Amino acid sequence: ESDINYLLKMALEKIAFLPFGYLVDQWRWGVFSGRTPPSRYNFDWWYLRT
Amino acid sequence: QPLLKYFQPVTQWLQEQNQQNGEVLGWPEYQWHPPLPDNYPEGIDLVTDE
Numbered sequence: 001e002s003d004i005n006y007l008l009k010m011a012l013e014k015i016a017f018l019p020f021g022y023l024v025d026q027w028r029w030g031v032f033s034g035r036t037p038p039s040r041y042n043f044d045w046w047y048l049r050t
Numbered sequence: 051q052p053l054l055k056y057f058q059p060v061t062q063w064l065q066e067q068n069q070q071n072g073e074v075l076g077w078p079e080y081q082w083h084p085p086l087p088d089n090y091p092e093g094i095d096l097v098t099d100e
């Protein structure tokens with residue numbers, strides 16, 4: 001039980017962050033490439049977030 | 051570019067009409083979906099033509 005508690009505490013920061021980072025730089029690469037014009041900043045950001 | 055040259059009069063007229071009507075090009079508020087009509091599944095055979 002202690003092992004499960006410790007690993008779930010660790011997995012709440014080392015696993016919940018994996019979608020982030022990937023998400024952030026994917027959005028920024030899209031913005032730089034021109035695939036995301038200034039009229040689609042929030043749209044693509046929240047599409048990637050969901 | 052030839053496609054835009056072909057449609058030059060109609061696109062010019064459209065731009066003039068949109069400017070006069072004062073509409074916003076594109077679709078901000080991407081997170082918008084139309085409401086369901088009241089009693090939709092059983093309210094379809096109702097005449098609504100002017």
Ligand SMILES: *[C@@H]1O[C@H](CO)[C@@H](O[C@@H]2O[C@H](CO)[C@@H](O)[C@H](O)[C@H]2NC(C)=O)[C@H](O)[C@H]1NC(C)=O
Pocket residue numbers: 078079
């Ligand atoms: C983008 O959404 C915002 C947030 O709802 C809209 O701002 C609201 O506009 C209404 C109508 O003028 C105001 O009554 C609200 O007070 C505004 N909200 C805030 C928090 O200021 C805005 O109109 C939307 N913009 C576009 C371009 O669609």
